[PDB]
Structures are given as C-alpha cells and as structure tokens.
Amino acid sequence: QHGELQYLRQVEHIMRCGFKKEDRTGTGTLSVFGMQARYSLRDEFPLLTTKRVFWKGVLEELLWFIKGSTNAKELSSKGVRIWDANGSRDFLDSLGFSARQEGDLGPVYGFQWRHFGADYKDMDSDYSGQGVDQLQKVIDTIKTNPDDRRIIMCAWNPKDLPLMALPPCHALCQFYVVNGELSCQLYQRSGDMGLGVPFNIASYALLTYMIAHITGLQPGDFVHTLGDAHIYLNHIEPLKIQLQREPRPFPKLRILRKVETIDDFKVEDFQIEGYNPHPTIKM
Amino acid sequence: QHGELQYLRQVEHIMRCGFKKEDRTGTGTLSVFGMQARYSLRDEFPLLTTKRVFWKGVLEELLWFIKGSTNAKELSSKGVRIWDANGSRDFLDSLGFSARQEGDLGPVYGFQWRHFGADYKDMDSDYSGQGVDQLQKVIDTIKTNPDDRRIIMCAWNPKDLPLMALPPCHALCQFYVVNGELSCQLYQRSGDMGLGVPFNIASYALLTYMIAHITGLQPGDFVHTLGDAHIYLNHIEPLKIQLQREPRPFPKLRILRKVETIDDFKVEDFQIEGYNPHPT
Ligand SMILES: Cc1nc(=O)c2cc(CN(C)c3ccc(C(=O)N[C@@H](CCC(=O)O)C(=O)O)s3)ccc2[nH]1
Ligand SMILES: Cc1nc(=O)c2cc(CN(C)c3ccc(C(=O)N[C@@H](CCC(=O)O)C(=O)O)s3)ccc2[nH]1
Ligand SMILES: O=c1ccn([C@H]2C[C@H](O)[C@@H](COP(=O)(O)O)O2)c(=O)[nH]1
Ligand SMILES: O=c1ccn([C@H]2C[C@H](O)[C@@H](COP(=O)(O)O)O2)c(=O)[nH]1
C-alpha cells in the first residue's frame, strides 16, 4: 500500500463520520477529534501526489524557521506569500497590535524554537544568546544520547500566547531513535485537511531529513497526530474529486552536499526527484 | 467491542513488532514510537479490568495536581506513595538538588498547570496570583467558546526543565467540544504499558469527567496518544498472562454531588461502581 492512502482514508473518514462544527470565522467545517498517520521516510518523501503541494514554500518556510525569524517580509521576499496575510497592517490591528510594525508576526515558531522563554519585544530585536535553543538541544541529545525519551521541541508557550498573531498549530514535536533511524512525531492541535495538512506533513518530514542528515542517522517514520482534524464546507466538492485520483509513487529527496550544522543548510542543497503529481486544485 | 481491547492490542503489538531499546537505567525495553487509542467516556469509565488499577491513587494524585502542590509528602500522607521515591533525599541528590528539601519535586504538573512561567523557588513558596493558570483557562474557554481549537493545558516547559526531578511524561493535553460533549487528547511522550499507562488513562479520563461536570457538558472520548510506548523486558511474562484474560465490562463513575468549581472537588464526591477486575 501507498503511503498517501492514509491521508486519503482520513479525509474520507472526516466526510463520512465528521460532525458539522463552527469555525473561528464562521465558515463551517466537518471535523473529527484525534487522528494519526505514519508516513515512511525510508527511501521516499511524503510529498502528496493527488494534489500538487507548494514544495518551494515548505522549504523556504522551514529555513526561515531555523533562521529564527518572525518577520513575514523575510519569507515573502523569497517568493513565499503564505504568512503575509497574518502580517498585514489591517490584520495585526484587528487584534490590537497597533504599534507592532508590518510583517512582525510576534513570538512564533522561529522565536520559540530558538529562544523559548525569552522576553519578546519586536521582530528586529536581538535575541542572541537568549532563551532556550530547543532546535540545537534536540540535535545534541540525538547525538550524545539516542535512547532519550525527552527529545522534545515545544512551540506552544502559554505565557507568550497573548503576543501571537496566530497560536502555533503545531504545539510540539518529539524525536526518537532506534536501529540507527530517526523518527518524528508531531502534535498538530488543529489541521485543515484540504490545504494546510499536506504542506505540514512535507514540512516536518523535511525537518527530520535535515536533522537525520546532520546527526548521521537515516530517516525513519513521521507520525502525524491531529487534534481537531477538519474539512471546510466549501472544500467538500473539490476534495470528493481528489479522492477519486490514484496516488502516484512518492518522489525522493536528495541532499546534494554534506552539511555540518542545521544553520548551514541552503536551498541549493535540496533536490526533489520524480515529483509527478496530478493537476493542482484551488482551495 | 470492549474498550480495553485497544490497550490489549497495543501491548500485543509492542511484543510482536517492537524493537529492543535501552532504558535510562539500562533495564531494557521493547518499544514502538507513536501510538493512539480512543476510549469512550459515554456511560462508562476506562478503568482497565484485566489487571487491577490503583484507583485510590489516581484520584488522590489528580486532586493533588489541581491543588497545585509539588510536595510529595502531601500526596503520601493521603496513602498514595507513588511520587515518594522521586522525593527522597538520596534521589534528589543524585541529580544535584542538595539544598532542595525532602519531598520537593520541583516545578512539576501542579505548578505548571496553575502557574506556568512563574519563577519557582521551593514547594513551600507562595505562588498566589503568579504565572498562567492554565487549568482555569481551559474551563473558562470551554464555557464561553466551545468551538475553540486552542484549548490546551501544557505541562511541558523547556525553561523549567532543569529544575525538575522528572520531566513530564504528559507533555500536554487538549480539550474539544461537539454535540454538547467534552473530549480530551493526551500527548504522552513516554509510556510504560505495564504500569503507568493504565493508571494514566484513568487519570485523564477522570479529569475530563470533572471538567465536563463543571462546564455542564457530557463526557465524550479520551484519545490517548503515545510517543515511546514501551514494555520492560521483565514484564513480558506476566503481560503474556494478562493478555490471556478477557476484559470484564467497565465500571461507571458517579459524582455524588453538584460541585461548582474545579477546586471544590473532594474525594467523597466520587464513586466507582461495578469495578470487577481480574486478580493478580
Ligand atoms: C483557515 C486556514 N487554513 C489553513 O490551512 C491555513 C494555512 C496557513 C499557512 N500555510 C502553512 C500554508 C500552506 C500553503 C498555503 C497556500 O496558500 N498554497 C497556495 C499558494 C500561494 C503562494 O504562492 O504563496 C495554493 O495551494 O495554491 S498556506 C495560514 C492560514 C490558514 N488558515
Ligand atoms: C519504569 C517506570 N514505569 C512506570 O510506569 C512508573 C510510574 C510512576 C508513577 N505512576 C503514576 C504510578 C502509577 C501506579 C503506580 C504503582 O506503583 N502502583 C502499585 C503500588 C500502589 C498500591 O497499589 O498500593 C501497584 O498498583 O501495585 S506508580 C513512577 C515511576 C515509574 N517508573
Ligand atoms: O500549518 C497550518 C496552520 C494553520 N492551519 C489551519 C487549521 C485551522 O484551519 C486554522 C487555525 O485556526 P485556529 O485553530 O487557530 O482557530 O489554520 C493548518 O491547517 N495548518
Ligand atoms: O505516569 C507515568 C509516569 C511515568 N511512566 C514511566 C514511563 C517510563 O518508563 C518512565 C519515565 O522514563 P523517562 O521517559 O523519564 O526516561 O516512567 C509512565 O509510564 N507513566
């Protein structure tokens, strides 16, 4: 069986057994609470094929995260517009952040991952040597002690919550090692199956490939755990279509050079081979 | 059909397909990474029956949590010894906490749940009005806005980690509401299937029952997600025996009176009916 079948069976399930549940905007969804899929990272990459995934966006965003940025403009400049809406003068004002300059997303992933617990001022501030560098922490631990059951990188910070444009959908992820293979489990509190999910799977599978490469291990599995797994009421039609399609063999991700530290990774180092998806779908 | 069959199928799986993996003590285990089970809370309580669960302990511990305590002695005095070992003068010293008094577990669940982000000194300190009161937070949100997808109570605190005797096994839990029913999902980073696990399921199922009672909702489901799900190499034999037993119908949890706030709960308010488990 093809790995994508899991994601498809989930969507199929949310439609068949989900419950109508209101949205924060009032759009309306069909949801199921608590789900889980295991995507293999062994000699293949989980880039969904029944619908084209914005790969260039998942890669630029991840590097942007690793770099510890919280400025949407720095990701926008790379040709990835995904986080721009949450950075607009209009949106940041509808939440009270009036003195907060444009693009300043607040203490999001980039900040939490590298400086957990540090006092956030603005995106342009210097947090060098401040907070807990969780990203580095997990890498060190994976190297020194692989048996460790506390390899956690937590983006969810209850105290910093009031300063965020958007509370982290990916509350936390945990790494694991066995048989010289590195695995990763993500806890996604809320997931849009028609848009965000596929991209999110790619994002974390990539992170694992990166950390595995640096630690000298082989990619294992990517366990995708969900809280509120939803499908927006309008996405039902196109999704009924996508569910008809047959998944084509997953591509493979090549890391073109030998990099030593997580920060040393650049876009030219990655190569997606054989990514042959079905035509794209607007949602 | 029976809810316990899930837990049994998991143990069965960990034996059948797990991999030998070393322990922090070097005891050795058989593990699988990433697992999940859905226990129904509708008209029944998930207190496992193929082996007796220390129910009096899950209840006293939970209240102890809610009370925001981090002193092991306060739970030990109630006749629940589970957290005593981690509080001894010997253990606290083998980790460096020499000036830390006996029983002082550090900024554990009780402290994180009620005062997240506050500067921890010692168990006897006064943290009134300090930190983020997560427990209260989720209760308020469940009442005012049930559709909310951010109802999270996080015990994992990367900054306070160096002050803990034991890093929280239960990193975080998330609440959900639909059809007037309250559900809960737990993220357990590491779980011992032979001991802590069944107790852990009971603990969180109970918490849901309490919060559901207070918010005026009905208990829904308890989703149990695991990171490193293991079985110690020595528990393999007794477990092979437990797996043979047939689960008896789950008991029911009765809340004997109408309580208003989470803190108002007392031991006399709960009653387990029909808990008929298998022996030893
Ligand atoms: C309700 C909601 N659901 C989401 O999934 C969501 C996701 C993000 C961020 N995210 C992680 C995204 C991943 C992929 C995206 C997307 O817009 N893809 C477009 C291409 C636009 C571009 O060129 O930048 C597409 O699929 O056509 S957006 C922000 C707000 C959200 N809001
Ligand atoms: C290796 C290991 N595995 C565990 O599951 C574990 C659990 C706790 C804490 N936990 C939350 C526990 C739940 C139940 C417990 C127990 O000791 N039950 C006994 C004794 C109490 C009694 O029954 O009077 C038993 O049921 O026999 S201990 C502490 C260290 C651990 N260490
Ligand atoms: O990477 C992401 C980010 C966001 N979302 C979607 C899920 C919900 O549709 C919405 C978040 O809304 P709240 O749960 O924050 O209300 O964004 C995703 O699916 N993936
Ligand atoms: O409620 C609990 C508390 C502890 N443990 C067990 C699981 C592990 O065997 C051990 C903790 O080991 P570390 O994850 O800290 O290495 O305690 C449980 O299963 N449940």
Swiss-Prot record, chain B:
Tagged with keyword Iron-sulfur: no
Record keyword Transcription regulation present: no
Binding annotation for dUMP: R24, R149, R150, C169, H170, R189, S190, G191, D192, N200, H230, I231, Y232
A matching Pfam family: Thymidylat_synt
Family: Belongs to the thymidylate synthase family.
GO cellular component: cytoplasm; cytosol; mitochondrial inner membrane; mitochondrial matrix; mitochondrion; nucleus
Sequence intervals crossing the membrane: none
Reactions that this protein is recorded to catalyse: dUMP + (6R)-5,10-methylene-5,6,7,8-tetrahydrofolate = 7,8-dihydrofolate + dTMP
Active site positions, chain numbering: C169
Upper taxonomic lineage: Eukaryota, Metazoa, Chordata, Craniata, Vertebrata
PANTHER family: THYMIDYLATE SYNTHASE (PTHR11548:SF2), THYMIDYLATE SYNTHASE 1 (PTHR11548)
Protein name (Swiss-Prot/TrEMBL): Thymidylate synthase
Assembly behavior: Homodimer.
